[PDB]
Ligand SMILES: NC(=O)c1ccc[n+]([C@@H]2O[C@H](COP(=O)([O-])OP(=O)(O)OC[C@H]3O[C@@H](n4cnc5c(N)ncnc54)[C@H](O)[C@@H]3O)[C@@H](O)[C@H]2O)c1
């Protein structure tokens with residue numbers, strides 16, 4: 052029972068607002084789109100189709116009614132262009148900012164465009180939101196911000212030194228957001244996601260995340276790599292948790308704003324057993340090598356979601372195994 | 388003496404390197420130019436004349452020989468364009484990055500522009516320097532990185548929360564510089580300047596610094612406005628100490644790199660006593676209203692320069708009194 056979430060969705064259905072989703076055509080963005088349209092919200096999407104796809108939008112078109120779909124206005128555009136940011140903020144109530152170029156190895160290899168997309172793009176959106184006087188601003192942050200902090204589980208107040216240009220950019224999102232609260236009174240929420248997964252996460256590409264990648268390899272009879280000793284642990288978080296948390300943040304009471312929240316489940320799953328988990332779930336629908344560690348890959352990761360539970364009355368309902376069961380069928384249809 | 392600093396400056400006269408100065412037309416960049424041409428160095432210049440002036444260059448030209456000027460290649464251009472940053476980096480040995488939009492209140496009214504110049508612009512130069520494989524990289528940091536931390540005098544490893552968009556940019560300069568060391572092995576030195584003053588510091592404008600603003604005011608017989616009770620204090624730093632530190636940092640040994648240093652004197656001077664000093668020094672070349680505190684103004688500022696003294700053999704040799712005595716003539720020539 053997502054009891055607080057249920058109640059908040061009910062306000063939204065009764066008094067529908069206008070939402071902006073940046074990165075609408077990507078994994079998390081499209082999932083947020085799916086839910087808000089089903090809640091009869093008016094949605095304004097912004098995407099440049101860099102990592103995102105037109106087929107993600109086309110899928111969501113088939114998952115919602117006509118009346119619902121007609122309340123979605125899509126704008127092809129770039130968060131790096133401030134003018135575009137201002138144009139899309141007009142009459143927006145709630146801002147869900149997901150647009151960015153993710154991936155740690157990407158930022159190492161092209162820190163320039165990454166900086167532009169993730170810092171310049173963010174500030175453009177943040178500033179346009181302040182000037183449009185939106186009612187809430189919720190943006191995608193990262194567990195990479197913890198950096199070389201050795202403590203476990205990860206507690207928001209305790210971070211270390213950033214280990215990648217990507218870690219930097221997301222921390223800079225946080226800092227700008229705090230300073231926007233200080234100097235302007237503009238209270239935002241930053242969601243440090245931890246290893247999200249689920250339908251519409253891109254399995255292709257040189258930057259594919261481990262769950263869709265491995266899934267994609269098993270469905271093809273390709274080799275499944277484990278980068279090192281296989282002992283690495285991660286806090287895998289199914290999108291529904293992330294959707295719940297964006298919407299709870301969007302309508303949080305004022306005192307809950309200007310805050311950073313871990314978005315995860317609280318569990319630690321080894322790569323050795325993720326390799327196992329996926330196999331079983333895939334093989335329930337009738338269808339392993341080792342190499343090196345990565346420069347920027349931490350031995351262990353696990354969140355403490357106490358703060359979200361307490362402040363936002365957050366209720367993570369889907370753990371890894373059930374997430375994968377809900378996810379595998381999507382990849383079957385998608386990869387054929 | 389300035390014996391280690393004199394060791395280097397004499398080494399440079401005998402054996403010239405190629406230097407890149409960004410912000411070369413501004414206050415600090417143009418003083419850096421004066422020194423480097425006087426030591427027969429080949430200097431590459433970059434400036435867009437945004438807060439700097441062609442007259443600062445023109446002035447340097449009159450203080451150096453024809454053959455010294457001949458080795459100054461000046462490029463009108465913008466650090467925000469990566470291509471420009473790479474063109475001005477070819478053949479360069481030591482980078483002195485001074486190009487930025489300073490002032491806190493500028494960044495509160497227009498955070499986008501300050502982000503573009505101070506974060507994007509900085510990263511371009513860092514990135515190009517990295518690629519060009521330069522011998523050293525030294526950049527203009529800021530005492531505002533201490534933020535809200537209560538300690539006084541200020542010590543480099545202890546910092547708090549950035550209190551404005553400008554502070555965020557300068558702190559992010561430091562973070563990126565530490566990340567570049569980690570990810571590419573490219574070791575830089577960042578200089579937390581504290582309230583620099585001297586020749587060619589713009590007395591005109593909304594954001595003119597206190598010393599040049601008051602010196603202009605007393606020569607014109609305009610009002611000297613003291614914001615507050617006048618017990619507000621600062622570590623006023625004469626340019627030669629900044630120049631000194633930049634050259635020390637450019638030719639610093641490997642282990643002294645990837646470090647942040649306070650550039651100041653270690654002293655505290657109140658606006659009250661300061662107005663006394665300015666006035667007294669100006670009367671030897673023969674020629675006040677209190678008001679509401681600047682909002683969010685730092686109450687007291689003072690650097691601990693122990694790190695610079697031990698690791699870079701810094702000598703904070705010119706205190707505020709002597710500096711003002713050396714700078715007063717320049718403002719008389721400039722305003723008549
Ligand atoms: N996926 C995770 O586990 C995870 C972990 C930490 C942080 N995040 C952050 O969550 C957010 C959601 O990303 P995702 O995982 O769905 O990846 P994604 O690539 O599927 O989504 C990113 C979306 O942003 C769009 N976009 C990128 N740059 C843009 C720009 N300049 N202008 C307009 N649109 C732009 C892309 O086209 C894409 O639709 C990102 O900020 C990501 O960094 C995700």
Ligand SMILES: NC(=O)c1ccc[n+]([C@@H]2O[C@H](COP(=O)([O-])OP(=O)(O)OC[C@H]3O[C@@H](n4cnc5c(N)ncnc54)[C@H](O)[C@@H]3O)[C@@H](O)[C@H]2O)c1
Nearest residue numbers: 410412413414415435437438439465466486487527582583
């Ligand atoms: N003066 C101080 O008390 C103080 C204190 C802390 C930090 N700093 C830093 O020292 C450096 C220089 O300061 P200053 O006092 O000489 O200021 P300044 O305004 O005199 O110098 C800045 C110079 O950079 C140029 N510039 C700005 N944006 C540019 C861009 N995008 N591309 C190319 N050139 C650009 C300006 O036109 C100017 O010539 C800056 O990084 C500043 O933030 C100064």
Ligand code: NA
Nearest residue numbers: 142143184185
């Ligand atoms: Na409104």
Ligand code: NA
Nearest residue numbers: 062302303304
């Ligand atoms: Na509410």
Ligand code: NA
Nearest residue numbers: 522523573574
């Ligand atoms: Na180096």
